[PDB]
Design a protein around this nucleic acid. Structure first.
Ligand SMILES: CC(=O)O[C@H]1C[C@@]2(C)[C@@H](C[C@@H](O)[C@H]3[C@@]4(C)CC[C@@H](O)[C@@H](C)[C@@H]4CC[C@@]32C)/C1=C(\CCC=C1CCCC1)C(=O)O
Ligand SMILES: Nc1nc2c(ncn2[C@@H]2O[C@H](COP(=O)(O)OP(=O)(O)O)[C@@H](O)[C@H]2O)c(=O)[nH]1
Ligand SMILES: [Mg+2]
Ligand SMILES: [Mg+2]
Ligand SMILES: [Mg+2]
Ligand SMILES: [Mg+2]
Ligand SMILES: [Mg+2]
Ligand SMILES: [Mg+2]
Ligand SMILES: [Mg+2]
Ligand SMILES: [Mg+2]
Ligand SMILES: [Mg+2]
Ligand SMILES: [Mg+2]
Ligand SMILES: [Mg+2]
Lengths: 669, 80
RNA sequence: AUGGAGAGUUUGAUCCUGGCUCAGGAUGAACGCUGGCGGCGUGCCUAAUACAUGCAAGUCGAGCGAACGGACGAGAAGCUUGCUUCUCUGAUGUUAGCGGCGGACGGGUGAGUAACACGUGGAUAACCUACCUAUAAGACUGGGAUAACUUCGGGAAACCGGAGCUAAUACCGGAUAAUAUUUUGAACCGCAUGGUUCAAAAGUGAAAGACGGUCUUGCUGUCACUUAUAGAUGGAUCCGCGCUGCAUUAGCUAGUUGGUAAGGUAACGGCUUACCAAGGCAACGAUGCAUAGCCGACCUGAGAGGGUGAUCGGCCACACUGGAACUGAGACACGGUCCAGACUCCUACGGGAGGCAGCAGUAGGGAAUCUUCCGCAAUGGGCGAAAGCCUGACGGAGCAACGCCGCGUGAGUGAUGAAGGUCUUCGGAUCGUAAAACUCUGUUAUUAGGGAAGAACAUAUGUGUAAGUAACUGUGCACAUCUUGACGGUACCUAAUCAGAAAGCCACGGCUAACUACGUGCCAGCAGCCGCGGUAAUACGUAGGUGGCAAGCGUUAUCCGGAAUUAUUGGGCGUAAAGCGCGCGUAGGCGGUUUUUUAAGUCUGAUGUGAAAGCCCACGGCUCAACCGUGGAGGGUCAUUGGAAACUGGA
């Protein structure tokens, strides 16, 4: 009938932070407080705070699970960034901060764990300023640290809250203590200056020395936050129930609504160039983005989607504009702190779960049947680690393929593909932990035990020395008589130039009919390895002389002659084995540049160069693909998780003597 | 389980108790009458009459069928 | 008479034989491309796989006690006569519980079943039947409990016990009543056993009240109750005949076959037990193995036949698996009970719970099959005196070109053969009256108005009439009136605006309707068969044109046809596949001429039946048609009965 909460009272927020910062504890406390006049599950939970609807998505911290952070920030409006008080900003805090910046999501910072030993609110704020270069300012002050932490001074209203217990109840609202009054006034001045740096009207009002009203200051903070120019910093301890109510109040006061957020732009299916703006309007056409897909053992497949514009009722038909198919919405569910509720309708700015959608994966657009809009999808990182996977029992390969398909639908960042050259199935993921979890899930949930290893590297062969060679084949002894003869000069071609066949035949000594057959025989014999079984590349074969018989000459005979010529050329030209070399670009803070270059040179690679980029450094190198195994883990260990890299096939290079000998021995036996 | 089904369970148990009591009584009377007829006793006719009374009351209660009661009476009164 | 088509391919060529292949029809179809609408149908064929969640069986207060509730309207004035308690009356009402009836129907499924399961025709003098109808006779007199409820105790829950009290149309004794049981006599009759009627006696139990009218507690209406005999309905058993593959399955059977006695059952019966005997089945296919629900019907075929057993109707069987009984008229019971088993779930760890092959839906399997929708308004069912409650039966709506049927995507004029594509002999030909342009229409579509039928009723209110009454109320019937629609403001109708939103698929070597240009060059590729492709490709890909169809068109799968290619209709065995190497001989098949007789086959007439729906013919109603409805015709190797004697069979 009528939406229980208006667009002006909706808050779609995500809790994000470094590992063990307290995201789950904070979410649990928030749910408990919203539910009182708690198991955390499902993509999003719906609650109510002070007449406002709050959708909460709790995100993972590990860099291995950046997919969840991406897919949540895509559909969310605001974010709460949690910081450990003792350490402030950490590497995954930085990563989630950059993701939120890329998605233009307003953020409020919350310094959790104030009661922990070593907690330093000022140091955490300084880390916000330095590590992130963020216009963040406190809107509160902590009275006490560690066990002494006992009150929070709200600076906007210059009011102290004293917490008398860890239960989160019986908070005393009092005036700021006199000894802390000067510090509170200084902090309020700093906050006002920070906001005024973005607001010109507030800047003039502050320069005029006139007192700032509470409502005016709250409005200015809201404007700056929703513009993503300011970051309010709060403090508390979710474990001991201090500051959670203040954090919720800040969520209401400063984080935006689906109206305050910037609009969404999509492309018409039939007019990709055409742009459609989908504002938060119930009366507009229905468009929503499916951001999560799971299987609930009780209700079946659940599709969690965020609705941007329009409304949609359960028990109807919608269009999957991305797939261009029709989906039956049979049931709509919303997950609360303790139970799931069936809801008959979903409006703009609501996160819900549909039951009965078939062939609707994450990132799909669900639009009204008549409409054909397509909203912007999500971009996820490319794989950073690759492993060759294979079932321990070959009888489960079909089960393995089906499990891989289902897992790829569940997880965008997990990829599986077959390599033609090596015939191996390779799984790519965001990290060792990611791949280990996926392997265990395949083993147990899908009952396909698999073993994983380093992917095989497809080597090549080449000729290092030039030589003129002859291939003759005479088979007149029995029955049909065959004759073939060729004289070919094999030359090391310029690396990367590929095979080049030249026909320097004079006088028709080799009939022009058989020359293509000679070239084809050379191509086949080069496809077959001459030193270790790998294809031969980068060779110039010049057919410069030969002989033929008016009857015995045949295409097969000349192919035999070409094969013999290649065999003798392999005997005489000292072939070598080539290995793929990857152009590798490594981005990291300069303080780890020496470690990165040392690791590159230890991987048998060479450092091509270095160059600043933004606030970090980029190192360009060439490393063997074989030596690039497990590089992401080493890079993260060297850079405290701050280093990233990309690698692309660049060229082939000669394998060292010992490595080539080992390869030859392995292939022979 | 249906409400009426639970109720029917209760009523079935009650009816079974009553029916088994009555059937046991009538069977005992029938056996006594048969023994008295087999070995002549001064109580023979009275026992046979009691057996017939209980047999007919059982047939009317539907514990046994009318034809079953008829067979019992026929054999009992042919022996007697 | 209503009905029957062939073609390619073995060769240098030929005729024959012979297989392979194609043109037709069909589908619960799937897939590929494409896709406008309406009507009527159809839609998990796979996993009788497992199932979250909601709903699918209740009803009766006019059977019963109790509890809650509190009108209408009592009393004191708090001086508030509008608000107040208990000392009342307490009506209209509601309910957990006892009791009655219904949960055995309705709905699902096809696992099992090769069997009197099913079909057809018969039989029961071997049977049973609540509710319903008719007739006749009754309903007399007493009693003891218990649920609920209160209290005490134990539990997470499921819920448990102990004590005390109270009802009934709950339960029980006694009284009278029999066509039922025993005995005796008599009469008549039949298909062995036996059946029907009459007369004597002995044993012998039934029941209940509720709501009203008249009020004389006497009479009495409706409903309900009991006994007996009939009707109706439903069920049970037996039997002839029919109904499937294999002998690379030949022996099977020991309660087995018969008799006697008893027990048991609604009922007959080795149904079961005790005894005696050694019988019973089987090449006319026993036994074993495999597969299968059967039928009406459905597809195909000229027919004979062949294939199938969705939707709809009948019969059967099953309800997680196996066994059992209870209650009951009826079950050995889908949403009952007990036990065992597998599996699953909850738990406070003490202990508890469950069965979608009901309707939706989930997971899974799959090439593949739908909404966790609306309403009891119609029809039907259960309960109720009735209003009414319940009803995922059912009536509707939603989805799917899945099928069939209907209508669109425009119509008239239009040479001036316009541009442009393709080909060209460079003249022209063709797309083409196609286009452009003028004129016209609005089926459709958009907008705005009007708007059905399906609805009969039941009940209630008025009278009239009929049995009974001493007379009413009531009961049956008849005529009137108020009211009852999920679909749905849907179908349909009217008015205005626009050709504007609405054509795709396959094929073009022969079979087989439709040919040319470029690209390729035994490659890429096509292909149902024969085959095509190596520079002149009507066979590969594209383009123009053409052909067939058209909201569908192609492909794949399966069935019948063509196939006389298992040949009864309707073929063969010298050389094409095919005469056992040859005797002797059993069963079986077949059998010379005449006469008399029988009526098993054979022929002919009558009667009953072969449900309904379906097919075919006719008619009627949706604007047509599909579809729907109503009559007719058809379908048996069917049965009973009466006739003929030529042939086959018997004497
Ligand atoms: C916020 C939240 O609930 O995070 C959860 C949800 C989470 C992000 C999970 C980690 C991981 O299993 C994730 C992946 C990517 C795993 C692969 C696929 O199965 C996909 C579909 C899957 C999607 C999400 C998922 C299930 C979480 C998590 C981290 C667990 C911590 C660990 C420490 C070492 C061992 C692991 C957490 O508790 O923070
Ligand atoms: N001392 C302290 N410990 C905390 C606080 N908040 C959370 N923790 C604990 O620190 C850990 C954080 O883990 P969790 O809350 O799951 O964080 P996440 O990794 O961000 O989801 C847990 O062991 C918490 O109990 C806090 O405010 N103070
Ligand atoms: Mg967490
Ligand atoms: Mg079967
Ligand atoms: Mg024929
Ligand atoms: Mg039942
Ligand atoms: Mg069930
Ligand atoms: Mg079902
Ligand atoms: Mg599947
Ligand atoms: Mg034939
Ligand atoms: Mg021969
Ligand atoms: Mg011979
Ligand atoms: Mg018929």
């Amino acid at each position: 009938m009528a939406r229980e909460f208006s667009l002006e009272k909706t808050r779609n927020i995500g809790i994000m932070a470094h590992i063990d910062a307290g995201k789950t504890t904070t979410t649990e406390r928030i749910l408990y407080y919203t539910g009182r006049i708690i198991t955390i599950t499902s993509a999003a939970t719906t609650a109510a705070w002070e007449g406002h609807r709050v959708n909460i998505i709790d995100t993972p911290g590990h860099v291995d699970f950046t997919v969840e952070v991406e897919r949540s920030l895509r559909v969310l409006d605001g974010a709460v960034t949690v910081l450990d008080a003792q350490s402030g900003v950490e590497p995954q805090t930085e990563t989630v901060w950059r993701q939120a910046t890329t998605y233009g999501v307003p953020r409020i910072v919350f310094v959790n764990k104030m009661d922990k030993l070593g907690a330093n609110f000022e140091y955490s704020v300084s880390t916000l300023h330095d590590r992130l270069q963020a216009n963040a300012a406190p809107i509160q002050l902590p009275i006490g640290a560690e066990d002494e932490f006992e009150a929070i001074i709200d600076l906007v209203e210059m009011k102290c809250f004293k917490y008398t217990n860890d239960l989160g109840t019986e908070i005393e609202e009092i005036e700021i203590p006199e000894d802390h009054l000067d510090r509170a006034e200084e902090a309020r001045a700093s906050l006002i200056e920070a906001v005024a740096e973005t607001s010109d009207e507030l800047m003039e009002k502050y320069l005029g020395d006139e007192e700032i009203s509470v409502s005016e200051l709250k409005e200015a903070i809201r404007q700056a936050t929703t513009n993503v120019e300011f970051y309010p910093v709060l403090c508390g301890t979710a474990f001991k129930n201090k500051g959670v109510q203040l954090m919720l109040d800040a969520v209401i006061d400063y984080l935006p609504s689906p109206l305050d957020v910037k609009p969404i732009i999509g492309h018409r299916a039939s007019n990709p160039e055409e742009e459609v703006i989908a504002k938060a309007d119930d009366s507009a056409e229905f468009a929503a983005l499916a951001f999560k897909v799971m299987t609930d053992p009780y209700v079946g497949k659940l599709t969690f989607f965020r609705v941007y514009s329009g409304t949609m009722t359960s028990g109807s038909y919608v269009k999957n504009s991305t797939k261009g198919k029709r989906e039956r919405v049979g049931r709509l569910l919303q997950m609360h702190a303790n139970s799931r509720q069936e809801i008959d309708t979903v409006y703009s700015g609501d996160i819900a779960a549909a039951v009965g959608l078939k062939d609707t994966g994450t990132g799909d657009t669900l639009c009204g049947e008549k409409n054909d809009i397509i909203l912007e999808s999500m971009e996820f990182p490319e794989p950073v680690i690759h492993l060759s996977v294979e079932p321990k029992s070959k009888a489960d390969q079909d089960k393995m393929t089906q499990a891989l398909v289902k897992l790829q639908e569940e997880d965008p960042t997990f990829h599986a593909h077959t390599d033609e050259e090596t015939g191996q199935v390779i799984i790519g993921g965001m990290g060792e932990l990611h791949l280990d979890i996926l392997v265990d899930r395949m083993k147990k949930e899908f009952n396909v035990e698999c073993n994983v290893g380093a992917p095989m590297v497809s080597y090549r062969e080449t000729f290092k020395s030039s030589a003129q060679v002859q291939g003759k084949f005479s088979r007149q002894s029995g029955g049909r008589g065959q004759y073939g003869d060729v004289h070919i000069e094999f030359t090391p071609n310029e690396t990367g130039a590929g095979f080049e066949f030249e026909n320097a035949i004079v006088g028709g000594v080799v009939p022009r009919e058989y020359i293509p057959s000679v070239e084809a025989g050379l191509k086949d014999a080069m496809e077959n390895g001459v030193l270790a079984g790998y294809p031969l590349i980068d060779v110039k074969a010049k057919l410069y002389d030969g002989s033929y018989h008016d009857v015995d000459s045949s295409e097969m005979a000349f192919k035999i002659a070409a094969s013999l010529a290649l065999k003798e050329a392999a005997k005489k030209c000292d072939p070598v084995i080539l290995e793929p070399m990857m152009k590798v670009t490594i981005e990291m803070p300069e303080e780890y540049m020496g470690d990165i270059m040392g690791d590159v040179t230890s991987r048998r690679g060479r450092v091509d160069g270095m160059e600043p980029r933004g606030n970090a450094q980029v190192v360009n190198a060439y490393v063997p693909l074989s030596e690039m195994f497990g590089y992401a883990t080493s890079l993260r260990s060297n850079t405290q998780g701050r280093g990233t890299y990309t690698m692309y096939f660049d060229h082939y290079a000669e394998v060292p003597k010992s490595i080539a000998e080992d390869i030859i021995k392995k292939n022979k036996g | 389980n249906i409400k009426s089904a639970i109720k029917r369970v209760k009523t079935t148990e009650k009816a079974e108790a009553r029916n088994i009591s009555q059937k046991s009584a009538m069977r005992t009377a029938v056996k006594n009458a048969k023994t008295a007829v087999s070995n002549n006793a001064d109580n023979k006719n009275e026992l046979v009459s009691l057996a017939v009374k209980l047999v007919d009351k059982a047939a009317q209660s539907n514990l046994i069928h009318s034809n079953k009661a008829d067979r019992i009476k026929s054999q009992l009164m042919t022996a007697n």
